[PDB]
Design a protein around this ligand. Structure first.
Ligand SMILES: C[C@H](c1c[nH]c2ccccc12)[C@@H]1OC(N)=NC1=O
Ligand SMILES: C[C@H](c1c[nH]c2ccccc12)[C@@H]1OC(N)=NC1=O
Lengths: 129, 134
């Protein structure tokens, strides 16, 4: 199989809850799993994302009681936000908005939404317009 | 410009310290910046990464005192680990360079990998695929 050049791996306090969030709310599918390690490799179109149940094999930068994901957001580029459940929700960190960003070679106009997953990871979907 | 389909954005407690880490230890370069916002868009080969000074415009899941990046690691695929300053012993190294086989969808991925821990605790995993056997 082909691995994307950038794949986030999210340790999940409750992998069942996280799996339901990513599959049912965000439309990811399970590509493969190592279920005996609580590990799931998810995909949606061209994006990939790994989930890992919190446990002894997890790579934890801070203590287990430290809330997850602070400071970061993952920007996923999508052709459209239509297949996302952006109902406006405790799952929504930033409601759908159109924003102009000044970038290297001009202005990137985007439609974007940010979700906050069950452990606090921020997942930003960006549609370039 | 072409935006990668997956780009992490890391809020940095000390943007100059983080910029020095990513550019000097990990070999990223600045593609462009928004200086007024403390924002930097970095690149290295096919990898892109965003850094932003902790401040008014930062998207923060938890309180500012909550340590950053817990639970996540970003896996960056690279052709080689050679250029990376993986030198030990270092507080920058979370997982020393190792070769590991992973069971994947259609076989086994044999990789060389190293995990860095950046100045705020974000884990950056560099993965060199040695082979995949079906
Ligand atoms: C807005 C930029 C961006 C990230 N991913 C994208 C996918 C399609 C089009 C644009 C983008 C980038 O993100 C932020 N926070 N500032 C930036 O310049
Ligand atoms: C090891 C896998 C992987 C992530 N990025 C890569 C780049 C090249 C070859 C393999 C990979 C993936 O990561 C983890 N933790 N388990 C997995 O199956």
């Amino acid at each position: 199989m082909e691995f994307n050049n950038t794949i986030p791996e999210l340790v999940c306090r409750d992998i069942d809850s996280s799996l339901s969030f990513y599959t049912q709310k965000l439309g990811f599918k399970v590509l493969f799993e190592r279920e005996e390690q609580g590990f799931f490799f998810l995909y949606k179109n061209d994006i990939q994302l790994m989930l890992q149940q919190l446990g002894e094999t997890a790579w934890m930068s801070h203590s287990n009681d430290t809330p997850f994901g602070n400071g970061m957001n993952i920007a996923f580029k999508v052709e459209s936000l239509d297949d996302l459940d952006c109902s406006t929700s405790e799952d929504i960190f930033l409601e759908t908005e159109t924003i102009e960003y000044r970038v290297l070679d001009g202005v990137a106009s985007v439609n974007q939404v940010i979700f906050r997953d069950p452990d606090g990871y921020l997942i930003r979907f960006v549609e370039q317009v």
